[PDB]
Coordinates of N, CA, C and O in Angstrom, one line a residue:
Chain A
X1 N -107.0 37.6 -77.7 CA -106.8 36.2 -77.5 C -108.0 35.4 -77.1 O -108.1 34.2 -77.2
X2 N -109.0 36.3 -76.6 CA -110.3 35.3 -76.0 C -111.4 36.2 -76.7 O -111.8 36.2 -77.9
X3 N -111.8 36.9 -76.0 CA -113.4 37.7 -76.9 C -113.3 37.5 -78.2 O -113.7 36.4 -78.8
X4 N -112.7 38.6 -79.0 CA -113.0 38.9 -80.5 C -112.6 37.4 -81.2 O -113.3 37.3 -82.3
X5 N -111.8 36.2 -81.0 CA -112.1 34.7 -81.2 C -112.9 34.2 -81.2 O -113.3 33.7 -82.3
X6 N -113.9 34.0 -79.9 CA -115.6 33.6 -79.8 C -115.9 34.2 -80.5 O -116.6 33.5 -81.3
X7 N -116.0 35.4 -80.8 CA -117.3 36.0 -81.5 C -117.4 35.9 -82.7 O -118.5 36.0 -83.4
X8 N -116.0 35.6 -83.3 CA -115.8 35.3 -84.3 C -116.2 33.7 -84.6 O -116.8 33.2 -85.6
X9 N -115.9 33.1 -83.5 CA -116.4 31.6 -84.1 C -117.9 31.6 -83.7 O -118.5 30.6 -84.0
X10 N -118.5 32.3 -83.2 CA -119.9 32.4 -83.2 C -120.6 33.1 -84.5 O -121.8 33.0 -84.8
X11 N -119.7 33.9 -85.5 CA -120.4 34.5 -86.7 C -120.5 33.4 -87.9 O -121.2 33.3 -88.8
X12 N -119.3 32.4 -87.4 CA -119.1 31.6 -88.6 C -120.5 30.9 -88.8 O -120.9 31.3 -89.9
X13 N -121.2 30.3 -88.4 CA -122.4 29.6 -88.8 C -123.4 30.1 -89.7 O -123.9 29.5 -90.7
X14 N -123.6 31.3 -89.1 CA -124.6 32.1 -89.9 C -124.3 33.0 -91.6 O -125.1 33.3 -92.5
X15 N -122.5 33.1 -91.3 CA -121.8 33.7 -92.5 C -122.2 32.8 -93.7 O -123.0 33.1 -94.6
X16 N -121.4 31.4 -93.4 CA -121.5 30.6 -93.9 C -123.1 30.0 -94.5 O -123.2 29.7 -95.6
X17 N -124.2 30.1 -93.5 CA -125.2 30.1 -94.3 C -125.9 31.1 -95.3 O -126.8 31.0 -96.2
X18 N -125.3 31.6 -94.9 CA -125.9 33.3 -96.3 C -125.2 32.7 -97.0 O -125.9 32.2 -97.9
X19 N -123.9 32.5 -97.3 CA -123.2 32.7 -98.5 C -123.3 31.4 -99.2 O -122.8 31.5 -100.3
X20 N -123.8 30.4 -99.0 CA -124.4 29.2 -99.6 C -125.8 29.8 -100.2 O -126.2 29.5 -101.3
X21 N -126.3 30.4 -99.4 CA -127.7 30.9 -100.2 C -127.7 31.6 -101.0 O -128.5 31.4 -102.0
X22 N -126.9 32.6 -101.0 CA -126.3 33.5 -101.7 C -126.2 32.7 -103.2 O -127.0 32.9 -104.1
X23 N -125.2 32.0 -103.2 CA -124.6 31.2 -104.1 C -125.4 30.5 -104.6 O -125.2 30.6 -105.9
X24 N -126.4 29.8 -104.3 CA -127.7 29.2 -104.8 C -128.4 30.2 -105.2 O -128.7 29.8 -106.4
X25 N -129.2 31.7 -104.8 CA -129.6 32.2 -105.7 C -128.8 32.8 -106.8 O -129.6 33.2 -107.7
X26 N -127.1 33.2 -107.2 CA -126.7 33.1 -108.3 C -127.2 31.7 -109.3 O -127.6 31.7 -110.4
X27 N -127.1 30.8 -108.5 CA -127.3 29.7 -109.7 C -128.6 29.3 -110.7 O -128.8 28.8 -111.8
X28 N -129.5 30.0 -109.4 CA -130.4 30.1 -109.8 C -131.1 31.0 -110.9 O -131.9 30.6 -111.8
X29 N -130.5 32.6 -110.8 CA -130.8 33.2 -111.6 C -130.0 32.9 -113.1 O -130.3 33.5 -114.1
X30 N -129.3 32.3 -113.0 CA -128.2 31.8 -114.0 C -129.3 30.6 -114.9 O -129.8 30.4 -116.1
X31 N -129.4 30.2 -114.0 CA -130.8 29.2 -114.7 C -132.1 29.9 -115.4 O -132.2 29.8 -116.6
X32 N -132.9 30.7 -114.7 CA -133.8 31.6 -114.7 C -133.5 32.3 -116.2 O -134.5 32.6 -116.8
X33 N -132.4 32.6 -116.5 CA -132.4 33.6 -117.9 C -132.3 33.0 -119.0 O -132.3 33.6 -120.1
X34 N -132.2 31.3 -118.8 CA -132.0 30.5 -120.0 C -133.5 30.4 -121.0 O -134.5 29.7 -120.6
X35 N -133.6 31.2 -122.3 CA -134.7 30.3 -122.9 C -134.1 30.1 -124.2 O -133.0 30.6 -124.6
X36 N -134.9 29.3 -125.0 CA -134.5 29.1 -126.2 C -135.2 29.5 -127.7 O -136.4 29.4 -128.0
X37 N -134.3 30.0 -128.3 CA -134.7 30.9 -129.1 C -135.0 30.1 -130.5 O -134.1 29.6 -131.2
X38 N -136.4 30.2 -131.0 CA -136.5 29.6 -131.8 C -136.5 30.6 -132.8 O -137.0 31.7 -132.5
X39 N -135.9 30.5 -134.2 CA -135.7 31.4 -135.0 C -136.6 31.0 -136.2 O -137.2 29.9 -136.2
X40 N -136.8 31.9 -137.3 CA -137.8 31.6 -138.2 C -137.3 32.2 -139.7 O -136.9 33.4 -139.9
X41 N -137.4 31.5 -140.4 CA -136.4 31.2 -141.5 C -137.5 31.2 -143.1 O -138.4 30.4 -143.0
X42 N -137.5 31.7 -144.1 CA -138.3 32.4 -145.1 C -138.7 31.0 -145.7 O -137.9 30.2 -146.2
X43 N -140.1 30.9 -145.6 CA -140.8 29.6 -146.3 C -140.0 29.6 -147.5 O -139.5 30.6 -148.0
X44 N -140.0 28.4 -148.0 CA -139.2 27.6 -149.3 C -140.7 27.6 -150.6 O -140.4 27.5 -151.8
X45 N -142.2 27.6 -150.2 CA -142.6 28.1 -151.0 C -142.8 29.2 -151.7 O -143.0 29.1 -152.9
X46 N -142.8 30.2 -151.2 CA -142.6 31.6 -151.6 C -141.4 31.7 -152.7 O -141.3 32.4 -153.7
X47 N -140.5 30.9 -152.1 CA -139.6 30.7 -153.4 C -139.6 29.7 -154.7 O -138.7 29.6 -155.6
X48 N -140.6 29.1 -154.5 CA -140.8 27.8 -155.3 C -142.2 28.8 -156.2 O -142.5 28.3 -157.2
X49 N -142.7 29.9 -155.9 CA -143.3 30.7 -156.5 C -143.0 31.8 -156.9 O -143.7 32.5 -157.5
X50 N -141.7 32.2 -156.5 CA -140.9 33.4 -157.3 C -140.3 32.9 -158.8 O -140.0 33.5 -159.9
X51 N -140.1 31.2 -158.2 CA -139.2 30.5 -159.7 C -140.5 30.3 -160.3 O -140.4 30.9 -161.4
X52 N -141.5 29.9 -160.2 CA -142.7 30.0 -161.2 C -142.9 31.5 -162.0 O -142.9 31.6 -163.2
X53 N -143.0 32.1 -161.2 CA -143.1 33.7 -161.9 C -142.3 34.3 -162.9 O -142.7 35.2 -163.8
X54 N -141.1 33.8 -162.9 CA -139.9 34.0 -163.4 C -139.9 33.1 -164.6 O -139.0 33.4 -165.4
X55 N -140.6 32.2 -164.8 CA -140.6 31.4 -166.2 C -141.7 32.2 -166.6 O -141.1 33.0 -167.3
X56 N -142.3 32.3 -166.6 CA -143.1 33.1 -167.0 C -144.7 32.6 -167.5 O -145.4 32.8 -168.5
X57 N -145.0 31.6 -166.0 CA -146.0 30.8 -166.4 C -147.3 31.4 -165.8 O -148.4 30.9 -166.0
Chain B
X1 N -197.7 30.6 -180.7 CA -196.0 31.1 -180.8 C -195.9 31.6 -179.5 O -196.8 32.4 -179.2
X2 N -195.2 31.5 -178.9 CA -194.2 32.2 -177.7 C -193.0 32.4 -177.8 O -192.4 32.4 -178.8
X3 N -192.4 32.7 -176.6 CA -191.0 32.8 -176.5 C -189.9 31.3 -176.6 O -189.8 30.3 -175.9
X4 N -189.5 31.5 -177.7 CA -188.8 30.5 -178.0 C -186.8 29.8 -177.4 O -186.4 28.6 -177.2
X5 N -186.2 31.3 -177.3 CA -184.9 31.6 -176.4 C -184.4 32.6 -176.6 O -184.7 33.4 -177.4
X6 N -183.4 32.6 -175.5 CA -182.8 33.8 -175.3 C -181.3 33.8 -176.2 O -180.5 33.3 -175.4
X7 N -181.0 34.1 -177.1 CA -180.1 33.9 -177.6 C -178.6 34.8 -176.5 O -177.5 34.3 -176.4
X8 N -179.1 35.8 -176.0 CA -178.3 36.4 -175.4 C -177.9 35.5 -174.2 O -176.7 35.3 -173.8
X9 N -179.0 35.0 -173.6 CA -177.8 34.0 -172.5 C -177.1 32.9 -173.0 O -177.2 32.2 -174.0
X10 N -176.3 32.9 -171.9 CA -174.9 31.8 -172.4 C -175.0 31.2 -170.8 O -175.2 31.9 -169.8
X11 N -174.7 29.6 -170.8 CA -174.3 29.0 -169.8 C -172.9 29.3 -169.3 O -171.9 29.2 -170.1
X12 N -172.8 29.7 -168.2 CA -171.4 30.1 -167.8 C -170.6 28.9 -167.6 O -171.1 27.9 -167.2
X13 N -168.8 29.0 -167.9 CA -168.5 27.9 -167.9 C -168.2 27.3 -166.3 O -167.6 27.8 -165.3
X14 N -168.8 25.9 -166.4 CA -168.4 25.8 -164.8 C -167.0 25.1 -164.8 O -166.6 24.1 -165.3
X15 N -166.1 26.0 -164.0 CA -165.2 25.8 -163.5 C -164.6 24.2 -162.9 O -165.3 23.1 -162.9
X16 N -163.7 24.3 -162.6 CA -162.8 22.7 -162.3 C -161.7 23.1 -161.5 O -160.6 23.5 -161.9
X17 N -162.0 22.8 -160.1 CA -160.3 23.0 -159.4 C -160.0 21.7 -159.9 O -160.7 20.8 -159.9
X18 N -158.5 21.9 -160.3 CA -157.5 21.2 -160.5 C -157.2 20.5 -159.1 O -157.3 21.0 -158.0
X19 N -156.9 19.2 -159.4 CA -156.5 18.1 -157.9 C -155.5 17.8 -158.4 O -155.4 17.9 -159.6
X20 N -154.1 17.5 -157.5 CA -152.9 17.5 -157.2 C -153.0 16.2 -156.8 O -154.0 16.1 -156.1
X21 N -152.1 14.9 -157.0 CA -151.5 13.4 -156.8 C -150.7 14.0 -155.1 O -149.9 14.9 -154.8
X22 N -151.8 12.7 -154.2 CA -151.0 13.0 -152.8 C -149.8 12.2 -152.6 O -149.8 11.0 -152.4
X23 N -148.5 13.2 -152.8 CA -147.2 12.6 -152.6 C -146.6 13.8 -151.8 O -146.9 15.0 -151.7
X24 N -145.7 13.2 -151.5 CA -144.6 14.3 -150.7 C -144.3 15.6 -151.1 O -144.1 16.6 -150.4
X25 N -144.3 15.6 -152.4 CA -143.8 16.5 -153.1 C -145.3 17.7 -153.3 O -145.3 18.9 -153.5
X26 N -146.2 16.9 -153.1 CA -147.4 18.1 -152.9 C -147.4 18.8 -151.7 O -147.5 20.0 -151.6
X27 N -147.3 17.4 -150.3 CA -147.3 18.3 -149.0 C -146.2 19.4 -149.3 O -146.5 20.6 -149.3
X28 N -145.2 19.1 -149.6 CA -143.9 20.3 -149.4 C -144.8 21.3 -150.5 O -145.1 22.1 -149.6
X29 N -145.2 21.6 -151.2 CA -145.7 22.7 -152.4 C -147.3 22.4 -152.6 O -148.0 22.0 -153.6
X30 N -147.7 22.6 -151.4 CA -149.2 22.5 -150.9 C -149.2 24.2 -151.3 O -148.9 24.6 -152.4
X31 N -149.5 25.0 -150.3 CA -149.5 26.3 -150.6 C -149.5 26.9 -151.8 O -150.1 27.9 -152.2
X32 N -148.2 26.1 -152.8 CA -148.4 26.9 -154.1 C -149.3 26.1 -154.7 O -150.3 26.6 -155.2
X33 N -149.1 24.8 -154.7 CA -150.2 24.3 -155.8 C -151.1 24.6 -155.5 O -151.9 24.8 -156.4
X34 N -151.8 25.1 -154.0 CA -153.0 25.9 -153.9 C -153.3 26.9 -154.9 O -154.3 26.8 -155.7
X35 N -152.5 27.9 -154.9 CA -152.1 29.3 -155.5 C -152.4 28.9 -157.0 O -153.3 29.5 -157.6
X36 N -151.9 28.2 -157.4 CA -151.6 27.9 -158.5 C -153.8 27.9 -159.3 O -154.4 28.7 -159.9
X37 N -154.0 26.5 -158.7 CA -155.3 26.1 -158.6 C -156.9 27.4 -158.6 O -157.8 27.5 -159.4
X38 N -156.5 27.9 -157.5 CA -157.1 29.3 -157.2 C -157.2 30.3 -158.8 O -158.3 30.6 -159.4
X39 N -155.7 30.7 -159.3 CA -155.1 31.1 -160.5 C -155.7 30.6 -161.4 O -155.7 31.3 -162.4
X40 N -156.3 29.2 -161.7 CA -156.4 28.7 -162.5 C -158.2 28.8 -162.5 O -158.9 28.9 -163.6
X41 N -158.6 28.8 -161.4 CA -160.3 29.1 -161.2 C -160.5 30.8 -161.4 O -161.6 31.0 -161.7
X42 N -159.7 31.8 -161.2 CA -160.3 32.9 -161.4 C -159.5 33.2 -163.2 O -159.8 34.4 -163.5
X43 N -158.7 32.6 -164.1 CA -159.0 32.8 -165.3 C -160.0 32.2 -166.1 O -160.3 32.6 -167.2
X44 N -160.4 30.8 -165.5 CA -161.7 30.8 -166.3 C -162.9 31.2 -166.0 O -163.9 31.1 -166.7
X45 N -162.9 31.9 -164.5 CA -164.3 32.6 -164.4 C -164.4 33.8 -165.3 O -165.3 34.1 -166.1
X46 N -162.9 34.5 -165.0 CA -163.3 35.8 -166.5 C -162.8 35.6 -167.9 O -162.8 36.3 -168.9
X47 N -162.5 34.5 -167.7 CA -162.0 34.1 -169.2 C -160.5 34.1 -169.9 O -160.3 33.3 -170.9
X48 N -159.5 35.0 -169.3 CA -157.8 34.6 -169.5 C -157.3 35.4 -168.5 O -156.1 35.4 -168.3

């Protein structure tokens, strides 16, 4: 009814600040893994010289 | 009398890169009309 109550409301402050930090560095690394992927797609000349070859010029 | 010519030399032919009209359609097919051009300078250095 009295001790393990205090002590308990004496953990709350400090609980509660970890677990906000906590939670910020999830957000963080959530952030952290985003990049963007630029992809790379077969020049359109190379094909505009395969149809040359193919006529037979 | 001297030396009059060499019938054996021949003036080599001088070459002509071809020029391409600057329009859009060159930037996009720059690369090949390069290719093309190049192709077109090493058959007349050896001849076809």
């Amino acid at each position: 009814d009295i001790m393990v109550p205090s002590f308990v409301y004496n953990k709350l402050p400090v609980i509660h600040f970890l677990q906000e930090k906590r939670a910020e560095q999830k957000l963080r690394r959530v952030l952290d893994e985003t990049y963007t992927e630029w992809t790379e797609e077969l020049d359109q000349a190379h094909v505009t010289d395969a149809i040359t070859r193919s006529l037979n010029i | 009398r001297a030396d009059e010519v060499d019938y054996t030399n021949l003036p080599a032919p001088k070459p002509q890169k071809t020029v391409w009209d600057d329009n859009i359609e060159t930037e996009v097919l720059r690369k090949y009309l390069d290719g093309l051009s190049q192709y077109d300078m090493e058959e007349a250095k050896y001849g076809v």
